[PDB]
Amino acid sequence: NEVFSRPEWMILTCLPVPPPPVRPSISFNESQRGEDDLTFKLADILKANISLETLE
Amino acid sequence: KKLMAQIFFGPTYYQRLRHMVDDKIHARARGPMQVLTRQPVEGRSRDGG
DNA sequence: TCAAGTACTTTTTCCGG
RNA sequence: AGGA
DNA sequence: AAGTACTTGA
């Protein structure tokens, strides 16, 4: 459908970053993080992206 | 007054089992919520729903 | 062109460490 | 690890 | 525990 689902959209150019409510940090005590899996997997993506960006 | 029925009466070895009502009993009416789903927590211990 | 194996998919009642 |  | 879909040789 030309409005909501063009085929070119199954290929990701710009990636939506979900907000903290989706990937909340299980913040045990004060000075100790506890970041969500998705928070880490995004960092991986972000890191993988910067290697490629600088590389090219 | 005597029972019209005669009762089968005598000793029998009976065991006390692990499961006691007061350890089972639970009630909640608002309380702790999950962080992710913002829904009630799990289990009697945690004061779950 | 079509039988047969291939990839590969998916579920399974309810409620303490 | 158990309970119906 | 039984399928859907896809690919392989006659």
Swiss-Prot record, chain A:
Region: Lid loop, residue numbers: 24-36
Organism superkingdom: Eukaryota
Cellular localisation: Nucleus
Modification after translation: The tandem 7 residues repeats in the C-terminal domain (CTD) can be highly phosphorylated. The phosphorylation activates Pol II. Phosphorylation occurs mainly at residues 'Ser-2' and 'Ser-5' of the heptapeptide repeat. The phosphorylated form of Pol II appears to carry, on average, one phosphate per repeat. The phosphorylation state is believed to result from the balanced action of site-specific CTD kinases and phosphatases, and a 'CTD code' that specifies the position of Pol II within the transcription cycle has been proposed.
Quaternary context: Component of the RNA polymerase II (Pol II) complex consisting of 12 subunits. Interacts with DEF1; the interaction is direct and serves to bridge RPB1 to the Elongin complex in a DNA-damaged dependent manner. Interacts with the Elongin subunit ELA1. Interacts with the Elongin subunit ELC1. Interacts with ASK10. Interacts with ESS1. Interacts with RTT103. Interacts with SHE2.
Record's function text: DNA-dependent RNA polymerase catalyzes the transcription of DNA into RNA using the four ribonucleoside triphosphates as substrates. Largest and catalytic component of RNA polymerase II which synthesizes mRNA precursors and many functional non-coding RNAs. Forms the polymerase active center together with the second largest subunit. Pol II is the central component of the basal RNA polymerase II transcription machinery. During a transcription cycle, Pol II, general transcription factors and the Mediator complex assemble as the preinitiation complex (PIC) at the promoter.
Free-text domain note: The C-terminal domain (CTD) serves as a platform for assembly of factors that regulate transcription initiation, elongation, termination and mRNA processing.
Additional facts recorded: Mutagenesis experiments demonstrate that the minimum viable CTD contains eight consensus Y-S-P-T-S-P-[A-S-N-G] heptapeptide repeats. Identical and simultaneous substitutions in a number of consecutive repeats are lethal: 'Ser-2' -> 'Ala-2' (14 repeats), 'Ser-5' -> 'Ala-5' (15 repeats), '2-Ser-Pro-Thr-Ser-5'-> '2-Ala-Pro-Thr-Ala-5' (10 repeats), 'Ser-2'-> 'Glu-2' (15 repeats), 'Ser-5' -> 'Glu-5' (12 repeats), '2-Ser-Pro-3' -> '2-Pro-Ser-3' (15 repeats) and 'Tyr-1' -> 'Phe-1' (12 repeats).
Entry similarity comment: Belongs to the RNA polymerase beta' chain family.
Name by which UniProt lists this protein: DNA-directed RNA polymerase II subunit RPB1
Gene source species: Saccharomyces cerevisiae (strain ATCC 204508 / S288c)
Gene behind the chain: RPO21
Residues of the full protein shown: 225 to 280 of 1733
UniProtKB/Swiss-Prot annotation, chain B:
Segment forming the signal sequence: none
Localization terms from the record: Nucleus
Highest taxon of source: Eukaryota
Coiled coil: none
Residues spanning the membrane: none
Family: Belongs to the RNA polymerase beta chain family.
Assembly and oligomerization: Component of the RNA polymerase II (Pol II) complex consisting of 12 subunits.
Protein task: DNA-dependent RNA polymerase catalyzes the transcription of DNA into RNA using the four ribonucleoside triphosphates as substrates. Second largest component of RNA polymerases II which synthesizes mRNA precursors and many functional non-coding RNAs. Proposed to contribute to the polymerase catalytic activity and forms the polymerase active center together with the largest subunit. Pol II is the central component of the basal RNA polymerase II transcription machinery.
Note: The binding of ribonucleoside triphosphate to the RNA polymerase II transcribing complex probably involves a two-step mechanism. The initial binding seems to occur at the entry (E) site and involves a magnesium ion coordinated by three conserved aspartate residues of the two largest RNA Pol II subunits. Present with 18700 molecules/cell in log phase SD medium.
UniProt-recorded name of the protein: DNA-directed RNA polymerase II subunit RPB2
Biological source species: Saccharomyces cerevisiae (strain ATCC 204508 / S288c)
